[PDB]
Amino acid sequence: RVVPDQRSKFENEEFFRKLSRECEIKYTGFRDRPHEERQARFQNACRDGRSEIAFVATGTNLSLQFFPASWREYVDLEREAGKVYLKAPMILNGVCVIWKGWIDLQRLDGMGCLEFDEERAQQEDALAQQAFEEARRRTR
Amino acid sequence: RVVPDQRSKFENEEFFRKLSRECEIKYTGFRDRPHEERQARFQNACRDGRSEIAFVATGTNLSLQFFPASWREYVDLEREAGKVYLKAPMILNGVCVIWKGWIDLQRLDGMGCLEFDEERAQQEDALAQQAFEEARRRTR
Amino acid sequence: RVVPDQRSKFENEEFFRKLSRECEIKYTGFRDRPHEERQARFQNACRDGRSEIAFVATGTNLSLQFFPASWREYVDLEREAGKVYLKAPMILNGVCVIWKGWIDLQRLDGMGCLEFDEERAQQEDALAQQAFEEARRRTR
Amino acid sequence: RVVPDQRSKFENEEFFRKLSRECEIKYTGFRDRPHEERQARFQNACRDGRSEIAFVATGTNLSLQFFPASWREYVDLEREAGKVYLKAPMILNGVCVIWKGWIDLQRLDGMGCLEFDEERAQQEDALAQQAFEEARRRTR
Amino acid sequence: MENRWQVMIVWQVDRMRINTWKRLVKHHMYISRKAKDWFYRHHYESTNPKISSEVHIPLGDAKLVITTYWGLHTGERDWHLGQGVSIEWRKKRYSTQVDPDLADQLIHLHYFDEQIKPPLPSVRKLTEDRWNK
Amino acid sequence: MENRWQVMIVWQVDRMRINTWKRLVKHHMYISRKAKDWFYRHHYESTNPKISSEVHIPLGDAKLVITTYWGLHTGERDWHLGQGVSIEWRKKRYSTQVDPDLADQLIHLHYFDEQIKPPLPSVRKLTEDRWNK
Amino acid sequence: MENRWQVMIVWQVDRMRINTWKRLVKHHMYISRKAKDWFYRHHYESTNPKISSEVHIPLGDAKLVITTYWGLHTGERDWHLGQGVSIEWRKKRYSTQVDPDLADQLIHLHYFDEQIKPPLPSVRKLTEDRWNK
Amino acid sequence: MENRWQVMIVWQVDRMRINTWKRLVKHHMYISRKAKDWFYRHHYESTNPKISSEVHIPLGDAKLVITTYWGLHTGERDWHLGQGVSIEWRKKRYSTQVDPDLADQLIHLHYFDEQIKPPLPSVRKLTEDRWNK
Amino acid sequence: NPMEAMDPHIFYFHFKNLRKAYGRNESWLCFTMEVVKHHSPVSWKRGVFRNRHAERCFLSWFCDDILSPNTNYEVTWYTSWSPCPECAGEVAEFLARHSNVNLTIKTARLYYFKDTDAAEGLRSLSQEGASVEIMGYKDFKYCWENFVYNDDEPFKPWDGLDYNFLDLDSKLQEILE
Amino acid sequence: NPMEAMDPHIFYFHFKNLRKAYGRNESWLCFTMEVVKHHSPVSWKRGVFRNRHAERCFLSWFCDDILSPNTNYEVTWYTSWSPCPECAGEVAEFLARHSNVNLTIKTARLYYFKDTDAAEGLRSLSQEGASVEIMGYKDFKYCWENFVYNDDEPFKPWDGLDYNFLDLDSKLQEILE
Amino acid sequence: NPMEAMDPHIFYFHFKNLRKAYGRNESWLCFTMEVVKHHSPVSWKRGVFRNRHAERCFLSWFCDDILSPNTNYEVTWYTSWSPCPECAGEVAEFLARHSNVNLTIKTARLYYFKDTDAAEGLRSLSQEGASVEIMGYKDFKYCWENFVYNDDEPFKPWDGLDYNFLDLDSKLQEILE
Amino acid sequence: NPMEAMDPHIFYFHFKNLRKAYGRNESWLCFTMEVVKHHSPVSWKRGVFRNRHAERCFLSWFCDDILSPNTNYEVTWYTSWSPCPECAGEVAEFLARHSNVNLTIKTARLYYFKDTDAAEGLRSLSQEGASVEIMGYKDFKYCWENFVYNDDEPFKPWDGLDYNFLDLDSKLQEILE
Numbered sequence A, B, C, D: 001r002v003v004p005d006q007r008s009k010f011e012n013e014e015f016f017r018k019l020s021r022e023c024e025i026k027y028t029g030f031r032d033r034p035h036e037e038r039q040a041r042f043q044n045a046c047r048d049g050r051s052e053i054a055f056v057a058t059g060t061n062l063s064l065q066f067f068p069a070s071w072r073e074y075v076d077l078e079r080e081a082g083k084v085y086l087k088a089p090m091i092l093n094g095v096c097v098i099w100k101g102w103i104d105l106q107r108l109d110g111m112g113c114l115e116f117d118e119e120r121a122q123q124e125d126a127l128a129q130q131a132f133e134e135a136r137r138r139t140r
Numbered sequence E, F, G, H: 001m002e003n004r005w006q007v008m009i010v011w012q013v014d015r016m017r018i019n020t021w022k023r024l025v026k027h028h029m030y031i032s033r034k035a036k037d038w039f040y041r042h043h044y045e046s047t048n049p050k051i052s053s054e055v056h057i058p059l060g061d062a063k064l065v066i067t068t069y070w071g072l073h074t075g076e077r078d079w080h081l082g083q084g085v086s087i088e089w090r091k092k093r094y095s096t097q098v099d100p101d102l103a104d105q106l107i108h109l110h111y112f113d114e115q116i117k118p119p120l121p122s123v124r125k126l127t128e129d130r131w132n133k
Numbered sequence I, J, K, L: 001n002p003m004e005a006m007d008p009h010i011f012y013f014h015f016k017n018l019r020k021a022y023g024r025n026e027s028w029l030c031f032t033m034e035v036v037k038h039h040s041p042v043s044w045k046r047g048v049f050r051n052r053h054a055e056r057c058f059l060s061w062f063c064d065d066i067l068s069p070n071t072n073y074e075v076t077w078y079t080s081w082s083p084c085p086e087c088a089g090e091v092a093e094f095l096a097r098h099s100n101v102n103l104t105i106k107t108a109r110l111y112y113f114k115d116t117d118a119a120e121g122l123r124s125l126s127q128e129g130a131s132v133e134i135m136g137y138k139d140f141k142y143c144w145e146n147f148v149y150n151d152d153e154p155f156k157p158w159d160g161l162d163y164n165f166l167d168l169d170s171k172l173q174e175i176l177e
């Protein structure tokens, strides 16, 4: 097993626990500005390029940053009216885990959690995928 | 006129004359090796990547180099059996001119000439195309 | 003439005039301290080593500094009681001129003027004395 | 005892033995030149300045070099006719030892040995003489 | 619609521990050379405008990088003023982004095999928030 | 099939005039500074393995570059041993490649407004073949 | 009695024109090289403790020096706070000390043969007192 | 008559161990810094024309020096071609000249407190003649 | 990174508002940054930057050394050129995010490349608090006595800056309207 | 020349008052220099010097950049060692000449070379205004919160500085009497 | 660029064929390049390269300084490692184009990353004239007396190189067959 | 230390025998040093030195790198100036001691400071084997095709060197007699 046992690392590795403690997310953006104007600036920033968006984990100093690809992954308004859904994959501790979550466009207080990604988990690599388990499994 | 008068520079500008003096081209490759083996090495190099090919102008120190795009344009064998056709566009003296020519796969002695390209001559630019005629037309 | 005509430069060269405008000299030392204590510090500094003494020209930003020779010339109290005489030679604009003057040990206000020195004016040099008149006489 | 026990180091310290093994000295100068001319060059070099003279120990890679003092100690011909006596003091391993010896002006083969110097052994120092016995006596 | 959104898991940190990270790595590169093989490339060798300076550490076969961000977005706990860090190990154009609690254990595989003058540059010392705890 | 074929019109030259171009530009950069704004970036800041060294000359609004190739392919006239040059003026991601007879006239628009010690770096002096003529 | 008293005719000056002399000579040495042959030797290559920095200018056959003093003695006109200058031309261990009004005419014999960006370093501009006049 | 004759007990050596002394001390100064406080001053900071380069090693209170001579006089055993060394410890203008067999024991008091990569610079390794033994 | 002052032979080489000034790619600025820490006295910062472009080199110094929460800042630039059309595309987003900075580019010369890319680029910079002006005789001498090694010698004007003011000012109300 | 602050792994390497500290030739100081310009507000200066010896490198910065007439200065050093017996022979002559400086070496460690050359050398330094003291727990933490990159983490003492104080203080009244 | 020789404490640090040698990313080579210019006498070149990888840094020196037509070259490397799998992908194309070079990597140690990428990478290097071997006691002392500051002191072997030879040689006929 | 060659715009700046050449203090030389090791083949050395004066910088390279016993050397300088009157006082003592060097300054220009100090200084240099000459059209082109990056383009003379030869040669028989 090479894909099912780092599937089993999501069962076991507690830094995947600490990432996935079903925790809240919040857009901490223009916080010095008053509360009503920033949802416009959030909505202006979501679907155009040339900008980033932040998502704090609300308990830690962890954040998710969506840089434009000039510097799967989507930021969109078309799912529901007045609410944006977020989803993006990443390669965290060598394994392909996708992060997804929702955020209330009016409160800017939402919920997000990353689940392990199985579909392009065949699209990992052959041996240089295991190169991080020349370091993770292979400790010294 | 902005496209028809650098069309008219091919009529007039004598460095486009010197490039297009209907002149011969020749694959000067593995010249220290004997004459028969190099047409294999030419044919091996034409359709795979990871290599370049040269085309001298047979009268000058000018050459055409086809680097792979990882470092319109085609190198192919499928036009005729035992003969390769070459064509590639470029932007020479600010204007879009395409270079094309044939080369005998057995002799490695051929003929090539660049003609002015009119199709993507709408795909030039708006004002920064003229930025070279902030230097060519605008001399100082 | 080589010694009598720079003897004649003291007659003529007006920077030797400006140096020798029979002008007053003054020990500007510990001026922020009150007036009575500094004549002790002047008298303590005059005959020991490891220190310098200043003599302003009282009209200009010119001063005379007596560094110790570890860094003719004398600083002494033995001439008169309660008064110090000063004399020292130098080589100013290439020529040997000696500076001498008196200073009141109680007022710290005196008088000094440099006169041209004739005795060791035979001890000048032969041709590298004239090397400054490869620049003074020889202008270009 | 501070002077008599490094007097006693000449009795005991075997690097003073190895220096003073009553050994021969030789002027190794212009050795590629023939044997007769170099005694002239030796005699020309002895009493003028601007030059050095060497004295090998004839058994070791030790030599004595008489640099001019612009870069007690004497090099002279006036002791005997056709023979030069040599004597110079130094401070070797912190202590004042004087080196003296004779050399045949015709053979350039002689004899020299350093004896401990007692006269200016009062002219050593007070405590910074012992600063090398903050290293020699004081090992660590 | 528009482009995609390249993610990097950026640990937001303070202003001050960044400027003690830039003083320990610059200590352990030039004047002390305990771990001297860390190519600290400068500002304008990057294409992302929110990058301060990468710390390319060649770790045997391939390079781990530690990059510094500035002026992202203001944080939640009244000091996280837009400056963060995202550690990333790439293997010949295959990129992953790693645990800080394992990354200092991953420098440990090469540096070093052993009140300290000075302490070794550990990224876990960097990324601990002085406000939540 | 396979990838495309990015062309650059490379003037093949000798071994020697390259190593008098690298000595005149390095003369007119550091010790003499007649035209000091020419950023000669070094070897491994490139992605194309057949690049020796670009000469980025910022010419007012945008940069002209002059790059040096090595080990391409052997030439026709018994000295062109795989080392060439392709002058290229780019304008904010819009690339063109220019006449050598006009490029020295194009440095002339900025450098310089006036047996010489030394002669100015002119690319026309570079690219003239000593074998065909 | 005691030692002798080596004199140098020291023109006392301000604090500020010293720190525009140290910025014009350092301009005309490194980044502009109009007169680049001026060996500005630093602090602890001297034996006199009241020396800031000599400016050894080799003027053809032999060197003119211009040295800077600090903390001598306080002056008469309420700014001369112990910092002065004594220009001195030596010729193979034969020392003379020269007029400032002639010294700038003596650099003029070698530098230079010709709103200026920047003005040339002239010692007459240095040694003029801003308080007596 | 003439001047006096300042002696220094100069151990004459070869050409080659000098140019492995100049490569071990330059190793243990710059790129490795086991004993980095050794101020190797260069050629023309000296008054004696037969001096190559002093090695000023400040040893606690005062400096030990190790200087290198060139072109003195030819030696006895067919390689000593005028290049030698005279180790000398000075204490605030009080000079002594020391045993090589004790000098390496005298660096040992400060350097260092502990097939070696590389061996430490020991002057006893320098001054042993490869021809008499 | 913040250079403290500048010698006057480059002050005249860069901060003169004429038509000789087209022949280089370098830019300069002088800031005057006044912190207001709440329940604490007002301190000051001051200095000059040069060349990475210059007015971004302010922000990499700004967001990495001096910055602190619960503050209010009165930044006051003094720039030779305008900010560059890409530079406006990376400074205007800063004070969008930070509303405690009252940044004020009272610059000296406008920008030679007169095109559409700088027209709204200076406009989009301006709706956030960036009071763009042109510095004048009140401010050139303020740059003289606070940023220039001026010999403690009074300010030397060039006669014509008062009417290099208005025809360069008129190219701001041309783009701001 | 004035270095602003210092990382704490050299603060402990130099400013600890123990018997491990004999193995180098380098010295450090921290000044706190308070200008009093008459009819003008009180400004401040602050910084650290290192190695030309260090406490003369103060004076070459002092007499060349900051100094100005009609002022009064309260210089307050904080030195690892004492000033060196030659260094006292070139700093004591300074405040002899300038009487507006109330210099105060409240140093940390005394000097290892216990000889006559430093006995009156620290005494001859002292009759001019140089109030030599030993810095203590009021001043080590003052050096901590004003000169050290201290993480904005509170001061770490080493237990024994209070009784490394007195037996090092007693070597001052030994030489001052 | 061609370093002439090397001190023996890095000769033993790099050119010893043991299992301690996995702890760095640097490589070394010693060439011995013999020109044969036709109708002209045989000259010589000799030197050492280090780190851009090292065996490409040979070729950038090779194709830019020394090279000349109508010649024949006998290049003889002496490498610590093998050439790297990417390095073989950029040196084997060189002597494909130039047939006058009889290059010969008689290296010392094989390559730690035992994978498919280096198996045919050393094979595809080899069908052009690159006679890959392993250097031995005839060649380690030849590297000693031509590239090492060897004190003019005779060669010091480490006992075990003769049987570090064969089991490292056997990993060449494993990949060449 | 031995620079290999030189670009021709400093060849004309230094090695032209005219009256424009008084305006610097720098000197150049080109050596051509032929070793003769006994019972061994004749090798060669060649290079250019510049500035410590230049013709002593030869000797510090000479006596420290190349020199070896039981040899014979044919050194052949090619100097812009003559050796300086102090330089003759430190090179003539060298080949006094070493009799296996047939040094030969066939220089180009004489020395501007025409005084007694250089008259016998070039004479006292000459009784040891130092065959002082003036280089001519046989030797300027020999310096051209062995020391100059000459484009592999033939030698460019300046017309007048043949009669700058004789009146500069006549200042050697003036001092040698």
Ligand SMILES: [Zn+2]
Pocket: I027, I053, I054, I055, I056, I083, I084, I087
């Ligand atoms: Zn800009």
Ligand SMILES: [Zn+2]
Pocket: J027, J053, J054, J055, J056, J083, J084, J087
């Ligand atoms: Zn000190």
Ligand SMILES: [Zn+2]
Pocket: K027, K053, K054, K055, K056, K083, K084, K087
């Ligand atoms: Zn490699």
Ligand SMILES: [Zn+2]
Pocket: L027, L053, L054, L055, L056, L083, L084, L087
């Ligand atoms: Zn000379």
